[PDB]
Amino acid sequence: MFMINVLTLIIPILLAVAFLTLVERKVLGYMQFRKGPNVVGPYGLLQPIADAIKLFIKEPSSISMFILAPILALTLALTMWIPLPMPYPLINMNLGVLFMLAMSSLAVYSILWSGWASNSKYALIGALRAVAQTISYEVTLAIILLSVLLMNGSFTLSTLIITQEQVWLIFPAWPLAMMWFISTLAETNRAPFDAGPFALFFMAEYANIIMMNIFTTTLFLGAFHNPYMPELYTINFTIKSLLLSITFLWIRASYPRFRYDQLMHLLWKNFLPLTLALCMWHVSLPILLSSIPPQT
Amino acid sequence: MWFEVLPGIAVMGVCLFIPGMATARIHRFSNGGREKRVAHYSYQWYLMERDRRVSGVNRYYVSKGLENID
Amino acid sequence: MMTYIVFILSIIFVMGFVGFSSKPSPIYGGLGLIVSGGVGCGIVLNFGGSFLGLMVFLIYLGGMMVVFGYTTAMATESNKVVLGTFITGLLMEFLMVYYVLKDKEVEIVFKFNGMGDWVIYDTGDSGFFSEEAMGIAALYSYGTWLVIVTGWSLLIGVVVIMEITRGN
Amino acid sequence: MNLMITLLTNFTLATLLVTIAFWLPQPFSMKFFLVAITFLLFDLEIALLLPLPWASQTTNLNTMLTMALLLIFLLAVSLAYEWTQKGLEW
Amino acid sequence: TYKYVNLREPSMDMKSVTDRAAQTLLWTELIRGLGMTLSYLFREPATINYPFEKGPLSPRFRGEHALRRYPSGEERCIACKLCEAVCPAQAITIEAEPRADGSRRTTRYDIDMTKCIYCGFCQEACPVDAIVEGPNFEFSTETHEELLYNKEKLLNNGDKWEAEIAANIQADYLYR
Amino acid sequence: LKRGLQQVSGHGGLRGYLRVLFRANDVRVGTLVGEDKYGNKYYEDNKQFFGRHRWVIYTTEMNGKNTFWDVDGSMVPPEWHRWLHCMTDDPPTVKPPTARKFIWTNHKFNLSGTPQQYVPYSTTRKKIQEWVPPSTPYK
Amino acid sequence: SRGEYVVAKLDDLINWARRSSLWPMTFGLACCAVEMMHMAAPRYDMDRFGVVFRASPRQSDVMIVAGTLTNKMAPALRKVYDQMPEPRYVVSMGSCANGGGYYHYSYSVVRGCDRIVPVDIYVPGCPPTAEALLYGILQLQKKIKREKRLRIWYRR
Amino acid sequence: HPGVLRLVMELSGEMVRKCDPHIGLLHRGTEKLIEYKTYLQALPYFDRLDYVSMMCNEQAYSLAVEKLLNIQPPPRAQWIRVLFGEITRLLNHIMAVTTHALDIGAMTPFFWMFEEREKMFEFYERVSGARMHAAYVRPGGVHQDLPLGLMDDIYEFSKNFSLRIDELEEMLTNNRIWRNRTVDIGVVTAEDALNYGFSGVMLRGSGIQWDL
Numbered sequence A: 001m002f003m004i005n006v007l008t009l010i011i012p013i014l015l016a017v018a019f020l021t022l023v024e025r026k027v028l029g030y031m032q033f034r035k036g037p038n039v040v041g042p043y044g045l046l047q048p049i050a051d052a053i054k055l056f057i058k059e060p061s062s063i064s065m066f067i068l069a070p071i072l073a074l075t076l077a078l079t080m081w082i083p084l085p086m087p088y089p090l091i092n093m094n095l096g097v098l099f100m101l102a103m104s105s106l107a108v109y110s111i112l113w114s115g116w117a118s119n120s121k122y123a124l125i126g127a128l129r130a131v132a133q134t135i136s137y138e139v140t141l142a143i144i145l146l147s148v149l150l151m152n153g154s155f156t157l158s159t160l161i162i163t164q165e166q167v168w169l170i171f172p173a174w175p176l177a178m179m180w181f182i183s184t185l186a187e188t189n190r191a192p193f194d195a196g197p198f199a200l201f202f203m204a205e206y207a208n209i210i211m212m213n214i215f216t217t218t219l220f221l222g223a224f225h226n227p228y229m230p231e232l233y234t235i236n237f238t239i240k241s242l243l244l245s246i247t248f249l250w251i252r253a254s255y256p257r258f259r260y261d262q263l264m265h266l267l268w269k270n271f272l273p274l275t276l277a278l279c280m281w282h283v284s285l286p287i288l289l290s291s292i293p294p295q296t
Numbered sequence B: 001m002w003f004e005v006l007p008g009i010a011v012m013g014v015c016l017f018i019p020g021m022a023t024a025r026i027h028r029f030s031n032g033g034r035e036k037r038v039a040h041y042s043y044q045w046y047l048m049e050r051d052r053r054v055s056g057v058n059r060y061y062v063s064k065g066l067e068n069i070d
Numbered sequence C: 001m002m003t004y005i006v007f008i009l010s011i012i013f014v015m016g017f018v019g020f021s022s023k024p025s026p027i028y029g030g031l032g033l034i035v036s037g038g039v040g041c042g043i044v045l046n047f048g049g050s051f052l053g054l055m056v057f058l059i060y061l062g063g064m065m066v067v068f069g070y071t072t073a074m075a076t077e078s079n080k081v082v083l084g085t086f087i088t089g090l091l092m093e094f095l096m097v098y099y100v101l102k103d104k105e106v107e108i109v110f111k112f113n114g115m116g117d118w119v120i121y122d123t124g125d126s127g128f129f130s131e132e133a134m135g136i137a138a139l140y141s142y143g144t145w146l147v148i149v150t151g152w153s154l155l156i157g158v159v160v161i162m163e164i165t166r167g168n
Numbered sequence D: 001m002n003l004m005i006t007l008l009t010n011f012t013l014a015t016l017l018v019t020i021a022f023w024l025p026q027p028f029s030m031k032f033f034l035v036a037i038t039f040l041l042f043d044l045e046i047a048l049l050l051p052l053p054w055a056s057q058t059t060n061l062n063t064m065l066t067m068a069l070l071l072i073f074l075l076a077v078s079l080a081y082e083w084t085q086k087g088l089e090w
Numbered sequence E: 001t002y003k004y005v006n007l008r009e010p011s012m013d014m015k016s017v018t019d020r021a022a023q024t025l026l027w028t029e030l031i032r033g034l035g036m037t038l039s040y041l042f043r044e045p046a047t048i049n050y051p052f053e054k055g056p057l058s059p060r061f062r063g064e065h066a067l068r069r070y071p072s073g074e075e076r077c078i079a080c081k082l083c084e085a086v087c088p089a090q091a092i093t094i095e096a097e098p099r100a101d102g103s104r105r106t107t108r109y110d111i112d113m114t115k116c117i118y119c120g121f122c123q124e125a126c127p128v129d130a131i132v133e134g135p136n137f138e139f140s141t142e143t144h145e146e147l148l149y150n151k152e153k154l155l156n157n158g159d160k161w162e163a164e165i166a167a168n169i170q171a172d173y174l175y176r
Numbered sequence F: 001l002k003r004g005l006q007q008v009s010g011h012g013g014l015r016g017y018l019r020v021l022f023r024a025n026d027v028r029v030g031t032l033v034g035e036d037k038y039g040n041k042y043y044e045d046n047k048q049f050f051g052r053h054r055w056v057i058y059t060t061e062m063n064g065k066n067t068f069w070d071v072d073g074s075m076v077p078p079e080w081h082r083w084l085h086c087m088t089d090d091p092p093t094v095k096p097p098t099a100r101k102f103i104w105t106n107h108k109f110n111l112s113g114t115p116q117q118y119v120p121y122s123t124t125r126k127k128i129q130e131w132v133p134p135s136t137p138y139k
Numbered sequence G: 001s002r003g004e005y006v007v008a009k010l011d012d013l014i015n016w017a018r019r020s021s022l023w024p025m026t027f028g029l030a031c032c033a034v035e036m037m038h039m040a041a042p043r044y045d046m047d048r049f050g051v052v053f054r055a056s057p058r059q060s061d062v063m064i065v066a067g068t069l070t071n072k073m074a075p076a077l078r079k080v081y082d083q084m085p086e087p088r089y090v091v092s093m094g095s096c097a098n099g100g101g102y103y104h105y106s107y108s109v110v111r112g113c114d115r116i117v118p119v120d121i122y123v124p125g126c127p128p129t130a131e132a133l134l135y136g137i138l139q140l141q142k143k144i145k146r147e148k149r150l151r152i153w154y155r156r
Numbered sequence H: 001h002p003g004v005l006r007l008v009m010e011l012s013g014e015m016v017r018k019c020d021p022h023i024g025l026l027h028r029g030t031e032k033l034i035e036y037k038t039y040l041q042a043l044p045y046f047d048r049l050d051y052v053s054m055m056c057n058e059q060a061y062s063l064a065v066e067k068l069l070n071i072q073p074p075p076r077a078q079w080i081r082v083l084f085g086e087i088t089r090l091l092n093h094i095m096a097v098t099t100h101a102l103d104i105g106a107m108t109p110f111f112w113m114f115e116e117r118e119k120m121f122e123f124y125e126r127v128s129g130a131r132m133h134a135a136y137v138r139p140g141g142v143h144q145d146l147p148l149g150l151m152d153d154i155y156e157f158s159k160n161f162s163l164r165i166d167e168l169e170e171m172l173t174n175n176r177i178w179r180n181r182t183v184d185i186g187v188v189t190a191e192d193a194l195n196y197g198f199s200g201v202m203l204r205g206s207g208i209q210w211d212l
C-alpha cells in the first residue's frame, strides 16, 4: 500500500506538468489574444499528450555527463514533494525546509553539469551566468524562510500548517513574503529572470515551478483544517495553489527580461539590505511582544 | 473568454487534488480507521512502542482499551 | 536488505573517496565528492541524525562543490595510472572487507571488533527535545566567545578575498 | 526504509524515463569569480544564523539578542564594506 | 512648431518624493500594468477559425492567373505579347502560331508561378482583359514540376470558375 | 446561464453536438442560410463580429475521399467562394450561374500529390523536321 | 493479421503525433518574415494547431525558408539545416525562395532553395497571404497523414 | 536568431572592446536589375527594397520621376498620396516599437499592435488588393482610385486606434523595468549626429531641430 502511496505521489505530477503546459499556453493566449490549442483534440488536451509522444519519438557530452545531468534534474523533480503537508505529508520530516534549500542547490549542480557537457564556449559562458543568477537568490530565499518560520517555531512545517489557522501569514510579514515570491520567480528561471533531452530538462523545470507554488501556498496561507475530513482542506489548498500559478502566468506575460548586471545589482543592493533589516526586525520583535513560539 | 480554458484547469485541478486525497484515504485505510502517529521525538516513539507492545498483535491501532483491567 | 546498513554505506563512502583520490579530471572529481558527501550525510542521518548532517548538506554539498565546479569551468579543462590506482584502492577495500568478515578483529594500529555494530546506541531514553538540535540551539546563550571570533574571521576572510582578487 | 524506498523509486522511474528517451532512436572574467566567493561567505554566515529559532527559548534573552544582532550586523557590515569598495561593479 | 518630450524634473515636494518612493518600494505602476493586461484577458478574442471561416478579401484582390474566354467563345487572348512586354519578372513566355482557320493564335503561353510577383501589370495591360487575377490563393504545391503553368492548365483554371471573375470584372470595369 | 444548455438541443441532439465540436472546432450554430452541392452547408450570423459572419461546414465522402476528418481549402463551389470572403454582402442565391457551356460542375479540388495532378509539357508541334533517309537501298 | 492491425493503428498514432505539434523555426530573411510573424498574429493563430514559434534549431520540426536566399547566406543555411533532428520537413515560402523569382537574374541569388535543401511544400506568393501559408501548413499536415513509415518498416 | 545580420563583436567580458556589423548577407542586386529595366517595370524594386514603407518608397520614387519630368500631379492624387503616406508612417513606427519589444522580451504589446496592423493591411487590400506590396503609385499620380465605402471606415479606425495607442502607452512608457532597461545607453552628441550621417529619428532624439 505504501508503494501505492509512492506511485500516486510521483506519477500524477507528470500529468500535472503536461496539463500545466496546456494551461499556461491557453491562458497566455487569452492574455495576449489567442484561442488555442483547440483544434487537435477537444479543447487541447490530446495536443500536449501528443507533444510528449512526438518529443519521445525523435532521433537526435561524455555519456556519463550527458546522462547524469537530466537524471539528476528529474530525480530532484520527483523527490521534492516529499514533506509538503497536503494534509498528511508522505514523510513526516522533523525538518524539511532545509531539505528544500539543499535540493535547490542540487538543481544548481544539474544546470552546471549540463553546461559543462554542452562543450561549446558560448553555451559554457551562458550556463555559467545562469548558474550565478540561480545561486544569487538562494541567500534571500533562505533568510526570508528563516524569518517566516521564526514566527512559528520549528522546522517541522506541520506546526506551520497548525499556526496558519488563525491568520494568513501574508499579513504579519507582507514585504518579506513579497520578496520571497520575487525570489521564487528568480529561482524558477522564467521571465523576467533569465541540448537535450529537452523533455526531461523542461519537465524538471516545470515540476520545480509547481513545487515553489505549492510551497508558497503552504508557507504563507491556507485554510482551516477539518478534523477527520481533509478533503475540504485539500480542495481549498489546491485552488489557492492554482490561483497563484495563474498569477505566476499573469506576471510572466507582461514584462521584459532584465539585463543581467541589472539583475545582480538589483539583488545585492536592493534586496539584501532590505531582507536583512526585515529579518533582524523579526528577530528582535517577538521577544518584545511577549511571544516566542513553542518548539515543542 | 475563459469558456474553453476551464476544462484544462478543471482536469489539472483534479490531477493536483488526487495525491493528497489518496494519501489520506490510505492513511485511514492502513490504520483500521485511525490516523497514523507522528513521533518527532524519542518520547513519542517510546510511547508508541509500548503501545504496539501491549496490543499483543504487534499492531498499535487496536489499543486494547480498558479491557485488560482485571 | 539486512542489518549492517551503516557498514554498507561506509563501504560506499570509502569507494567515493578512492574514486576521486585517483586524481581524475576535476569535474569527475567533483562528481565523486558529491556522491561521497551524500552518503556521509546518509551515515550521520542514520546515527540519529535529526539535524546536523542535513544542516551541512546545504553547505558542504550546497555551497562548496558549486563553487568548485564554477572555478573549474572558468579556469581550464583513459590514462593507465588513474585506472590502475583506482583498481588497487578497490582491491585494498576488498581485502579489508574480507578481513572484517571472515576473522574476529582487524588492526591497522588499533583493535577493531570485526562485526557489524549497532552497538553502542541509546537505550530508548526519554529525550523529548532532540538532543543534537538543542546542542545546536546552543552557541547563542553560552556561546559568547565562539561566534564572536567566528564572525570576525568571516569578516577578515571577506576583506582578504577581495584584496587578493585586486582590492580595489 | 520508507524514504529510502521512495528515493530509489524516484531514481528507477527517472532511469526508466531516460532509457525510453534514449533507446527509441537506437579566458574569463574576474567579476564572475567574486560572485561565487561572495555567495560562499554569505552562505557561511547563513549557516551560522539559521539555527536561531531552535535557540530562541533561553533564559538569557539579552545575550541571545545581542549576539544575534552582532551576527546580522556583521553580515550587513561585510556587505557595506564591499558596497563602499565597489566590490560588485560590472 | 515643435512639441518636445521630457523637459521636466520630478519636483522635490515631500508628497512628490514619497509618491515616487511608494512607486519604487511598492511596485504600484507595475501592478497597474498587470491590471491592463488582465483587462485584455477578459475581452473576447479576435481570432477566426480558418478552415471553416476563410478571411475577408476585396473585390480587387490579386490571385490565381487564369485565362478567360469569350461568352461561349474562343480564347480571349490573341498572343499580342503585351503581358510579356510588361511582366517584370518575365515569367510570361509566348509563342504564337496562327491556327488553321486563318485567325491568329498561340502555341505556348506559360507563367512561372515561381517567378511571378503578382502585380497585375498583365491585368492592367491585357488589351482585351483575357488574363485576369483570380480570387483564391491555394496552391501549396508538393512539386517544383507543377509550378510551371501551361496553356491548358490556365484554361482549365479559367474553366474552374467564371462567375467569380464575372462579378469582379463587373466590379472593375468602372475604376480600372 | 442559458446559452450553454439550450445549444445541444439547439443543435438537434448530442449526436451532432459531439460531431460538430469533435469534428474540428466550433459550436456557433443556428442561422441556416443554405447548402450546396457535395453536401456542404453555409451559415451566416448577424450577432458576432466581422470575419465571424459566415462559415462553411463541409461534409464527408464528396469525391471518393472519406473527408469526415482533414477538410481542405477549396472543397467549395465558386459562388460560395465569392460569398464567403465577404466580397459581397449577398448570398449566391440571387444569381449564381451563367449560361455558358464551358464551366465544370464537378469542381475537381486540390489534387497535388495524388494519382491525378498537373504536369508540365511544351505545347508546340515539331521543331526542325530531320531529313529522313530513303527506303530503297542503293547497291 | 492482428500484428498488421496493430501496425496500422500504431502508425496512425505516431503520424497523428508528428502532425499534431509541429513547432517550427522561422528562418525568415526579408518581408516574408514579416508575413510569417503576421500569421502568428491574433487573426491567424498557429497556436490553435499547437504549432508554436521557437528559435531553437535542435528541436525544430519544419524549417520554413522565407526570403531572398543569397550566396553569402547559403553555407549558414545548410549549417543550420544539418544540426536539425532527422525528422525534418521543409516549407519553401515565397517567390524568392521557391524558384528565385523577382531577383532571379542576378548574381548572389540561389535560384530557389531547391539547390540547398530538399523541399517538401512549395507555397507561392510575393508575399503570400498569411491565410495561404496556413493552408500550406494544412497540406503539409495531410502529407504527414500519408506517411506509412511503420508499414514500410514492417514489410521492408 | 537573437533582421538577419552577421555581428562580429570583440569584448572584454560582459562588456566590449569593438565590433564589426557585417552586412551583405541580404544583397540582391537591385541597382543592377534596375539598370536593365524600365521605370514602370522596376517600381516594385523600390517598393520592396525597404518593405515596411510600402507606400513611402513609392512616393519617393514617384516624386523623383515627377521632379525630373515636369509634371505637377492633381490635388486629389496629392491628398490620397499624403493619406497613405501617413498611414504607412503609422505602420512603420508601430513595427519599430513592437519589434523593439519582441527583441527586448515583452511579448503581449507585439500582438496587440499586430491586430492593428492586420486591420491596416485590410485597408490596403480594399484599396489595391495586395496584402503588403501595393505598388499602386504610378509615376504621374496614383492609378485606380479608392472605391466607395472607405473613408468613414478609416474614420472609425482612427477613433479606435487612438484608444489603442493610449492603452499601449499605459502598458509600456514609464514602466519601471523598461526605463531600467533602456535609459542609460545610446547617447549621441548632436554635432556628431550631424557629422556621422545620422538622419531621421536620430536628429529627433539628439537636440537639433530638423524635419523635411
Ligand code: SF4
Residues within 6 Å of the ligand: E076, E077, E078, E079, E080, E081, E082, E083, E084, E094, E125, E126, E127, E128, E129, E130, E131
Ligand atoms: S496581353 Fe492579353 S491578349 Fe496580349 S498576349 Fe498577353 S494574354 Fe494575350
Ligand code: SF4
Residues within 6 Å of the ligand: E083, E086, E087, E088, E089, E090, E091, E092, E111, E115, E116, E117, E118, E119, E120, E121, E122, E123
Ligand atoms: S502579375 Fe506581374 S509578374 Fe505575374 S504575370 Fe502579371 S505582370 Fe508578370
Ligand code: SF4
Residues within 6 Å of the ligand: G030, G031, G032, G033, G066, G067, G068, G093, G094, G095, G096, G097, G101, G102, G125, G126, G127, G128, H048, H051
Ligand atoms: S517573395 Fe516577395 S514578399 Fe517574400 S521575401 Fe521575396 S520580395 Fe519579399
